[model samples]
Target: TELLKPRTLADLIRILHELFAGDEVNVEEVQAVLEAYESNPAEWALYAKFDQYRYTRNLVDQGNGKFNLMILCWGEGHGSSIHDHTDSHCFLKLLQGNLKETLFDWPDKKSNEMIKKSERTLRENQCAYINDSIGLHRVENVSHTEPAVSLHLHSPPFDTCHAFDQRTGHKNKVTMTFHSKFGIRTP
Candidate 1:
């Protein structure tokens, strides 16, 4: 239901390669790839499961580690802490419900003091992306009862990232893990 057409992992990997394997790729390429995707929610129905607990599912981890496709299920009123994606570019497409994407500018760069920069609400079928240089974000579903499902595609998939705690203005580097594999919940 969410795809422009039914698609496969190889197709997605090719699009990522076209968009990121080059020395210079424009932002439009990201949009193009996402727009070109053709898939029905049925293709990954299992991964769409949501809870009060948000979870990230890894669909395809490129064997060469060139890129990866992730499905993130966010519970209503739940979101991530302001965070950096290490050195990966990311594309987020809203598959169901609504999401608010908040961007931050690090005034302190390392400490966690950041300026609230911008915020955007993405509805179903809407998509957004961030390059490595601009990977600071805190995305959440805005609804109180409805869950949100999003597709996240990233290049040079990250192993770790930095999370910011607004309460203490502290930044901590965290190792990342997957809660599922190939559309199946794992943990």
Candidate 2:
């Protein structure tokens, strides 16, 4: 499927809205869209709020419950807990800086140890896709001095997800929160 490169942030969102208009979302199609995304920091600069203690998730678009578009900011040395996407399809595009994605096999039911599958460093403008069927993962900033910003999309948006413990593989459902909504910070 041939998709036009989005020139503006609003145009990108419009394309996404149309793409998700159908009853079923094609993973490849979504991936293609993300792969073609134009990186323009000026458009989303307001939502890129970096934190010293942890990364921040800013809601860029709610997608009317069909999907969620977000901008995640990561300070140097920041990372996420190993987690599962639940039932949603997750897409990520590195908008700025670099990140390391570590993949893991679902924990063994008894041993509770998650087997490492693979790991890769993604550079700016690179895109990745994942779903529960593919297993779990953790994303971390690869830099020690620079902050990073990533664009994320989750279809059939989820309000909660299982965060797995790296040591024991124990999982706990956590209600997701946004540092900002539509570029407005949450109080």
Candidate 3:
């Protein structure tokens, strides 16, 4: 029972590291671990650095290539363009403010149209999961004044992803970057 309790970021990383040590990762198991651990803003606060122009990605742990845990900070109204995860499993938990996630279908080969699939709002401590098999998604902070923060887990970390134009479905390969690693801002 003591091992099951989540009290710090260190504990979270230890559990995930042990879980990901297996040859194959079970998505359900990963989500379950995330759900079991309640959000601890105090433990994650150091990595919650925000950017005015866009959301900031702060690396928490690199799971020996099996997964990467990050804390994403979103300024009010800041959001991501519709994007694919490059075959990685993505799990997000809202830690601070409300966020709206909109899912879109794969673009038509010729028409380049990405039809809307679904949309939902995530409040504090709410978790969501997605992968390329599901669809692409765009996530934004819904608040007008308050900033939002989320913890993101991407399995088998990806270096690049396809960002699609919401209006035209035009796509661009974008390289992923981190604003900070282990709570220190990257220069």
Give the candidate number with the greatest TM-score. 2
- Over the stretch 1-187, how does candidate 3's per-residue lDDT look in tens digits? 1237556668878988888887777777777777678887789988998888999999999998899899999998899989999998899988888899999988876655677798999988878999999999999997899899999998888879999987778899999999999999996
Off by over 4 Å in 2: none
Task: Tell me the lDDT of candidate 3.
Answer: 0.87
User: What is the clash count of model 2?
Assistant: 0
Query: For model 3, what is the error of residue 163's alpha carbon versus the real structure, in angstroms, after optimal superposition?
Result: 0.4
Q: Tens-digit lDDT track for model 1 on 123-168?
A: 8767798764774788877788888788887666776888887654
Candidates ranked by lDDT: 2, 3, 1
Query: Which candidate number maximizes lDDT?
Result: 2
> Could you tell me which 10 consecutive residues in candidate 1 have the lowest summed lDDT?
1-10
- The candidate, 1 or 3, that scores higher on lDDT is 3
Question: Between the candidate structures 1 and 2, which one is better when assessed by lDDT?
Answer: 2
lDDT of 2 by residue, 1-187 (tens): 4578887888889889988887789888888788788789999898898777999999999887799999999999999989999789999999999999999988876656676799999889899999999999999996988899999999888879999987778889998989998889895
**Whole-model lDDT per candidate:** 0.70, 0.89, 0.87
Question: For model 3, which pairs clash?
Answer: none
Cα shift from native, residue 110, model 1 (Å): 9.1
Model 1: lDDT of residue 63 = 28
